[model samples]
Each structure stands twice: as C-alpha cells, then as structure tokens.
Target: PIIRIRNLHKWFGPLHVLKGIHLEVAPGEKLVIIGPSGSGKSTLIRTINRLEDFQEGEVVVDGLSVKDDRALREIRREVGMVFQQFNLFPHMTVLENVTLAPMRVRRWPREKAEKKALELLERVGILDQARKYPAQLSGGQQQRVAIARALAMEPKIMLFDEPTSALDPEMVGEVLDVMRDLAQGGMTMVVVTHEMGFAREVADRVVFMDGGQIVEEGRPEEIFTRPKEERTRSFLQRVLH
Candidate 1:
C-alpha cells in the first residue's frame, strides 16, 4: 500500500476526531471517503501530510512516517493535498502560484518551474488564465490553478479534502473533470466529497465514516446498492437521490 493508517487516533482539545481509523490505499488506487459533516473525514486525509497533528497511531505514506521531521518532509514531497477552499496564493498570478513551490521547495530553476507550471495550467485547461490573479478567474478556474500548483511538485499521491464543495453547481463539474483526467492517468487519490456521481463512478473503493469510525466500506456498487450496516443504509438513504 502506498498509504497506510493503523489504529489512528486524533483530537481537537478534548473532543476526539478520529478513533482507531485503519485504512490502506494501494498504488494508483482511487479511494473515496464519505460521511456526514463532522465525521472526521477531513481530519482523516489531513493526517496523511501532517497538516493536522494526531496524538496516537501511525500515518505512513510511501514508506515514510509523519512521526519524524525528516520523514515528514519526504512524505510531504510525495503527497499533494487540496482543500475545500481553493487555497491559492491570492495575490499571485496563477502561473506564479503554481511555480512558487517547485522553485522554493524543490529548488527547480525558474525556467524549469515556469515551464512545468505552464504545462500543468494547460493540463487543467486554464492556461489562458495563467497570467491573471486568482480573483480574476471564476471559482472553477481558481480551483484548477490550485490543482496545478499541487501537481507542480510532482507528487505521487493526491489527497483532496472536499475539493469541489465550495464551487457553484456549474463550476463543480469542471474541477471534477480535471480530477477525472488525473485519475485516468493513474494518480493515487484519496477524496473526501459528497458528490455521489464521482463517488459511484470514479471511486475504486468507498469508505463510509461516521462519528470518527468507519461504519462500512466496499465497492461503489455495494455501498450504494447493498449497504450492510444500518448506519450505512441511513446515510445512503439521506444523501442518495
């Protein structure tokens, strides 16, 4: 497995966020995590890159543990994370936003960084907007720039925390389309989203998390069509149209 979580435990103040999460994602697999808000779904993915701290258990990515400082750097290098808010460098142009990481963190030369940035911007279908600041583009375009920024680092695994949740209904499809292309290209992905079509059609596996526990997990067909647990059934009943 390229991503592993064993008996993971996390907390926010005194409230426990993740309780004994045990999961694994093989290389090139697309894993979708779904649950109601406050289910610890976001926290689950955040631990992969140590964006959030956990008090117990292990988060090992591509054989590097987030428990060590040097290991954390190596792990972050390979893991690209996207947030719900399209967290781009607001003041930077789209091209600059994408190029900064490669130049600063990876130490790529300016020409090389910009070269890849342009390619990624094109890959995400927003090359024409590259010279503009994020505010000048639509929500969908900004999100694509965020994706390009993540790809600039050449990450092996992409963790998306509700990537399309903040976009307008019209904008959601465009961002998801870019993600579909990434999935087709065999990028390892762990997505937390409520988008049923993406969950059913794009996910290789679906995990149903609730109250900090994995209530049920299975293929999209199984979880959507024949959930075994009552909790799973109830969630599907509420969310699925």
Candidate 2:
C-alpha cells in the first residue's frame, strides 16, 4: 500500500468528526468516498494532506507519517489537493496560477514552471485560457485550471474534496472528464464526491461514510447494487435513488 491509515481520529470541539478511520490506498489505485453532507468525508481527505490538523491518531501517506512534519512535507510535495471551492489564486492568470506553486515551493525556474504549467493546462484541455484570470473563466474552466495547477506539482497522488459540487449542472461534466482522464492515466486518487456515475466509472472501490465512520466499502458494482450496511443503503437511497 502507498497509503496506510490506522485508527485515525479527529474531533472539532464537541463534535467527533472522525471516529476511527482505517483506510488503505495502493499505488495507482482510485478510491471514491460517498455520503450525505456533514458525514466527515471532507475532513478525512483534508487530514490526508495535513490541510487541517487532527487531535489524535495517525495517517501515513507514501511512507510519510502525519506526525512527522518534514516527512509529511516531502510526501505532500508528491500529493496534490483540489478543493470544493477551486482555491486558485484569483488575482493571477490561469497559467500563472498553475505555475506559481512549482516556482515557489519546488523552486523551478520561471521558464520551466510556465512550460510545465502550459503542458498540464493543455492536458486538461484548457491551455487556450492561459491568459485569462480565474474570475473571467466559467466555473468548469476554473476547476480544470485548479486540476492543472495540482498536476503542475507532478504529484504522485491526488486528493479531491468534492471537486464538482459547487459547479452548475451544465458545468459538472467538464471537471469530471478531466478527473476521469487522470484516473485512467494511473494517478492514485482518493476522491470525496457525490457524482456516482463518475465514481462508478473511475473508482476501483467505493467507500460509504455515515455518522463519522466508514459504514461500508467494496467494489462499486457490488456496493452500488447491494450495500452491506443499513447506513450505506440509507445514504445511497437519499442521494442516488
């Protein structure tokens, strides 16, 4: 396994967000997490990248333990996170936004960073929008830029936190298409999303979370057709059909 999490726990004030999460992601595997709102799906992914600090337990990614900052930094350099809000540098052009991290964090030269950024933007099918500011682009375009920015880091794993939830109905497919391509190209992914069709098509496994715990997880076909837990069934019923 490239990532191994054992007995991971987190609490926000009085609310227990993660009871005890035990998840494993093998190299080049894609795992999709699904559940209703406030089920701690977001928190789980955020902790994987150390975006939010947790109070207890452990999370290990690519041999780097969460408790070790220096080690985590190295692992995070190889991991990319895409958020629900598309957290791009709005003041910068799409290409600039994509190039900034590689330049600043990785210390790649400006020319090299821009070159890599353009390649990634092109890969996401949005290189033509390189000169436009994020606000000038559609939500779908911005999200693709966000994905390109993440890819600019040349990450080994991608963590997605509902990457398409904030998009309009018409714009959702564009982001999903880019993400589906990423998965097909063998990038390990741990995505938290409600897009069941995308999940079924791209994910090697489907995980169902409810009440701060993973209720059940299995091959998408089996879990979607016949869930093993009542909470999983309830979540699927409320969301899918």
Candidate 3:
C-alpha cells in the first residue's frame, strides 16, 4: 500500500473526530469517501499529510510515518492536499503559485520550475490563465490552478477535501472533469466528495464514513447498490436528494 492508516483516532477538545480508523490505498487507486457533515470524512484525509494530527494511531504515507516529526517534510512532499477553498495565494499569478514550491523547496532552477509549471497548467486546462491572479479566474479555474499547483509537487498520492464544494453548481463539473482525467491517468487519490456520479464512474472503492468511523466500504456498486449497513443506505440519500 502506498498509504496506510492503522487504528487511527483523533480528538478536538471533547469531540472525537476519528475513531480507530483503518484504511489503505494501493498505488494508482482512486478512493472516494462519502459521509454527512462532521462525520470526520474531511479529518480522515487531513491526517494523511499531517494537516491535522491524530491523538492516537499511526498514519504512514509512502513509507514515511506521520508520527515521526522528522519524516513530516518528506511525507508532505509525497502527498499533495487540495481543499474545497482552492487556497491559492491571491496575489501570486497562477503560474507563480505553481512554481514557488519546486523552486523554493526542491531547489529547481527558475527555467525548470516554470517549464514544469506551464505543463501542469496546460494539463489542468488552465494554461491561458497562467498570468492571471486567483481572483481573476472563475471558481472552477481557480480550483484547477490549485490542482496544478499540487501536481507541480509530483506527489505520490493526492488527498482532496470536497474539491468542488465551494463552487457554483455549474462549475463543479469542470473540476470533476480534471479529477476524472487524473483518475484515468493512474493517479493515486483519496477524495472526500458528495458527487455520486463521479464516485460511481471513477472510484476503485467507495468508503462510507460516519461519526469518525468507516461504516462500510466496497466497490462503487456494492456500497451504492448493496450497502451492508443501514447507516450507509441512510447517508447515500444525500447524493440522491
């Protein structure tokens, strides 16, 4: 497995966010997670890159253990994170936002960084917006830029937290389109999404999370058409509605 979580648990004050979770992601697998709000779906993916630390249990990404402080940098480098907010640096041009990391952290030359950045921008279908700032682009374009930025890091796995949730309904498809392309291209991704169609089409597995636990997980059809648990059936209504 490229990603592994064993007996994971997390807490926020008195609130238990993840409860003894166990999951694994094989290389080139697309994992889709669905759940109601506050089900720790977001938090589960967050722990992968150490954005949120777990109080107990261990998360290991690409052979680097999350519990080891020294491995944090390498772990983050191996795992890219994209959130619903499209958290781009508003002041930086789209091209600059994608180049900064490779240039600064990876110590690539400017020409090399820009070369790679342009390719990622083009790959995400945002090459024309390269010179523009985040605010100048539509929500979908901005999210694509965010995806391009993450791709620039050449991560082994990508973690997405409701990547299209903040967009207008019409804009959602464009982001999902790029995600579809990524899934087809054999990118290992763990996505927290409510889009059932995307899950049905692209996911290798659909995991239903509830109250910080995985209620059930199986092939897309199994979880959607023959959920083993009542909780899974109940929450599947969110997408159906």
Which has the greatest lDDT? 1
Q: Estimate each model's TM-score.
A: 0.97, 0.97, 0.97
Q: Which segments of candidate 2 are over 4 A away from where they belong?
A: none
Model 3, 36-119: lDDT tens digits are 999998888888888889788889888889989999899878889899997788899999999999998899998999999999
Q: Identify the runs in model 1 with alpha carbons over 4 angstroms from their true place.
A: none
Clash pairs (backbone) in predicted model 1: none
lDDT of each: 0.91, 0.89, 0.91
lDDT (10s digit) by residue, model 1, range 1-241: 9988899999899999899999989999999999999999988888888888889998888988888788878887889988989777889899999999899999999999999999998899999998999889999998888899998999999998898998999999999999888988788999999998988989999999999999999999999999999999999889887
TM-score of the candidate numbered 3?
0.97
Question: What TM-score, to 2 decimals, does candidate 2 have?
Answer: 0.97
In terms of lDDT, the poorest run of 10 residues in model 2 is 66-75
Looking at model 1, report the run of 10 residues with the lowest lDDT sum: 68-77
Candidate 1, residue 123: lDDT: 93
Candidate 3 regions with alpha-carbon error over 4 angstroms: none
Alpha carbon lDDT at 98, candidate 2 = 91
